[PDB]
From a paper:
Sixteen ovarian tumor (OTU) family deubiquitinases (DUBs) exist in humans, and most members regulate cell-signaling cascades. Biochemical analysis and five crystal structures of OTU DUBs with or without Ub substrates reveal four mechanisms of linkage specificity. Mechanistic and structural studies of three closely related, unstudied OTUs with distinct cleavage profiles revealed four mechanisms for achieving linkage specificity, namely (1) the use of additional Ub-binding domains (UBDs), (2) specific recognition of a ubiquitinated sequence, (3) the use of a conserved S1’ Ub-binding site on the OTU domain itself, and (4) the use of an S2 site enabling DUBs to bind longer chains in a linkage-specific manner. We selected three members of the OTUD family for additional investigation: the unstudied Lys63-specific OTUD1, the cdc48/p97 interactor OTUD2 that cleaves atypical linkages (Lys11, Lys27, Lys29, and Lys33), and OTUD3, another unstudied DUB with activity against Lys6- and Lys11-linked diUb.
To understand the specificity of OTUD domains at the molecular level, we determined high-resolution crystal structures of OTUD1 (aa 287–437, 2.1 Å), OTUD2 (aa 132–314, 1.5 Å), and OTUD3 (aa 52–209, 1.55 Å). The catalytic domains are structurally similar to each other and to OTUD5 (Huang et al., 2012) and S. cerevisiae Otu1 (yOtu1) (Messick et al., 2008), root-mean-square deviations (rmsds) being from 0.6–1.0 Å. Catalytic triads are in competent conformations, as observed for pOTUD5 in complex with a Ub suicide probe (Huang et al., 2012). In OTUD1, OTUD2, and OTUD3, the corresponding secondary structure elements are present with or without Ub bound, and there are no large-scale conformational changes in OTUD2 upon Ub binding. Hence, the ZnF domain in OTUD2 enabled a Lys11-specific catalytic core domain to cleave three additional linkage types. S. cerevisiae encode only two OTU DUBs, yOtu1 and yOtu2. yOtu1 and D. melanogaster (dm) Otu1 are orthologs of human OTUD2 (38% and 53% identical in OTU domain, respectively), and OTUD2 and yOtu1 both bind cdc48/p97 and are involved in endoplasmic-reticulum-associated protein degradation (Ernst et al., 2009; Rumpf and Jentsch, 2006).
Numbering used by the authors:
A (entry chain A), B (entry chain A): 135 to 309
The structure:
Amino acid sequence: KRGASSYVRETLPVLTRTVVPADNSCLFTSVYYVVEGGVLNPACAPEMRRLIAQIVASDPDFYSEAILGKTNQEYCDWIKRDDTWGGAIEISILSKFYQCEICVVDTQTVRIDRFGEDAGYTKRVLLIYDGIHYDPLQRNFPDPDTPPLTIFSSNDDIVLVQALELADEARRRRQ
Amino acid sequence: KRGASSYVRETLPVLTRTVVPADNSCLFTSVYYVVEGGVLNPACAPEMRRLIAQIVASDPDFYSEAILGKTNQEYCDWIKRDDTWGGAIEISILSKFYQCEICVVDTQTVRIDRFGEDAGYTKRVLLIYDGIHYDPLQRNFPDPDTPPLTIFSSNDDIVLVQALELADEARRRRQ
């Protein structure tokens, strides 16, 4: 029969995805979810786009065509549209605003893209990206009381270890 | 446009499954794969079953009905059949024989079952189990030269962190 006495069971916290709506707002909704401590607000994008436009218009010395791929005013008009999709340029701006490292695991390349890698921020948050859609990641614990965590120490590299595994498994399921 | 300059890419080694045949030999084939350094030998089971029977018959003081769920002779006849499936009793015996901790991640319970947890072995190997089929796990590296690794230090808990993630993702895909 079974053998239940011949081993010691172990468990640890794991990272899990929380799914946000599959629309062009997903970057903004995912970022809000993790910097807010794990709370979905599907209406956050217009305020976040306005914030990004304010930041970019206020620093044209930095935010030029070479960075934005559009003129500074053209970019600001563009980010304020309700139909545009966010990406790396906006994640970099939001990382600086929130003063938080944003680590995006990419399931197409099995790599983490770290925004704020050298900034000395004390916290990091994680998203997962498949080339079109972003979702937020959180740490779930193996106990019934601890709520999920979305904001990590920037010295916590366990989350990076686990995120990469999740990306690798996703890319293998895709293949 | 794209934003490729605004982040630092990072990667790390990840654990991956190597698939062994979907038949009743899978425990034995998976164990051979990892203790042999990552080599599939689909013909290993008869020799491994004979070894287990020899070990059990040689220590009836320990290997009684309370451990085996059969009489010692009934167990030895049973393990030598070519149609029987291995499980925890056999993993515990093989862990002692190989002097290696065998860590089975269970995708039904999202837990690692550690055989040899307190034995002071200096190496560990990992399998993944879904309630019926075992496959071996290995560490693959993000470079073209390092071959995959199946035998870890028993102080390497990164492999446990990553295995649990893989189990969690498997149980969520099942649901």
